[PDB]
């Protein structure tokens, strides 16, 4: 992608933070966000606001009033529209030059290859249900597709306990635990000699608050923001190693 | 006092399930002021609206600029040139049409701070980036025991997991916080106490600053928004703790 003057105006602050090479790297990147909800809608926003030049959004759910407490697209006039389309329209308002694709579908074990094989720079997995989540992680891991997944973000109030570690090492996260169990039984994914699954997971050390679970923007959005920052760090590091 | 509607419970049922029923009403009855609707404050304002805060005041007189796009939730193609506080207020009304939103189209000064703080806020979130008015706001809220959380510099930082809350005296790697301490002392007589604390809660990051990489500091949504989100979570926790302690 050739960066226009308007793009340099919008993302001058990105360039001043990450550098010119990173700005170009981001403009040339294509990142996929799967699940445009409490975590993924903010991830998508952050990607757009950091000069990522191409974004794919995968979700088939609509905006509901009950999303209001934790999803950036949940506004009165958006209720009943497709989440992914509302977020795509917002991204075009953030960066009119971003290449935005909507996949109006849910990821399944049956279709993940079709969806994941377009060649993404990174995949951010913000799915809440274990079966498709395991199928997505297993596929990206096998195919060496850069992935960051997110554990359970509900039932938590403290954004400062969010961190990234190998999926094998998460604690206080029942979703991540169920995911490990399904990866093992259904996909043969098991931890290596060093006790790692080779899957990066955003999780929180906070113990869950039972009232399903409630949620707050301040936590669920930070899950998405930490996923994006982690992906960009890994992308920049890889680019720095080439040469 | 706000009567919580059935629509409010649809919007904020997840808030009640997380913080509790008493908290839902506490939030609906609260009036929180966000000073500075920029890289930090615009996301704080968003988070307050989405957590069922019943009245929000926004204080800023700046306009949306295309260069805000990297880090401010209101920075959209069609908002460029409009007043930030008014754009953000209209958004809050779309989030919660029953939220009482007040716009103060002004900057805080030593001359006007008492008037603007005279409404009796449940909490003040200080997201000012300029030291002069920041010091005046902090000194006033501190003297008057007005609940306040301030934010250091969120620019020049890339790692959201290093953001935390501490006493303003103990921040590191934050030149804005450093200048602010100096102005508080020289202009307002605010100095640290026996325990070395200023008695002001400050959001900062332990991350070392990243200096400008092209042609001041750069910034990213993932960090500046998390400053605002950590500030809101801290304020809501302190409000809940105070309500529980009355009893
Ligand atoms: N298999 C899948 N592929 C892609 N997206 C998915 C899949 N399964 C779920 N999603 C989406 O992931 C998102 C998760 O959002 P989140 O957990 O914040 O709450 P929600 O599902 O919108 O609300 P609620 O939990 O009350 O139904 C949702 O938008 C959902 O539609
Ligand atoms: N005295 C004040 N009273 C109220 N709001 C203020 C005051 N001083 C500054 N602010 C606001 O704090 C916000 C800070 O935003 P941030 O530092 O992320 O970038 P910015 O200042 O918007 O960028 P730029 O300086 O390039 O326009 C601004 O919107 C500014 O108007
Ligand atoms: K947890
Ligand atoms: K710092
Ligand atoms: Na942290």
Numbering used by the authors:
A (entry chain A): 3 to 213, 237 to 268
B (entry chain B): 2 to 216, 237 to 268
Give excerpts from the publication.
The enzyme responsible for t6A cyclization in E. coli was identified by comparative genomic approaches and analysis of LC/MS data sets of genomic deletion strains (ribonucleotide analysis) as CsdL, subsequently renamed to TcdA, for tRNA threonylcarbamoyladenosine dehydratase A. TcdA is an ubiquitin-activating E1-like protein with detectable homology to the adenylyltransferases MoeB and ThiF. To further the understanding of ct6A biology we have determined the high-resolution crystal structures of CsdL/TcdA in complex with AMP and ATP, an E1-like activating enzyme from Escherichia coli, which catalyzes the ATP-dependent dehydration of t6A to form ct6A. The tertiary structure of monomeric TcdA consists of seven β-strands in a continuous sheet surrounded by eight α-helices.
The asymmetric unit contained four TcdA chains arranged in two independent dimers, with a solvent content of 39%. In the TcdA-ATP complex, ATP is bound in a cleft over the C-terminal end of the central sheet. The residues in the P loop form the floor of the nucleotide triphosphate moiety, and the adenine ring is inserted into a hydrophobic cavity. A short hydrogen bond between the main-chain carbonyl oxygen from the P-loop Gly40 maintains the α-phosphate group firmly bound insite the binding pocket in a kinked conformation. The conserved Arg72 and Lys85 contact oxygens from the α- and β-phosphates, while Thr68 and the strictly conserved Asn69 in the H310a helix anchor the γ-phosphate through a water-mediated hydrogen bond. In the TcdA-ATP and TcdA-AMP complexes, the region between β7 and the C-terminal α8 spanning residues 214–236 is fully disordered in electron density maps. The TcdA dimer is maintained by Na+, which mediates monomer-monomer contacts through the dimer interface, and by K+ ions, which play a structural role in shaping the monomer fold.
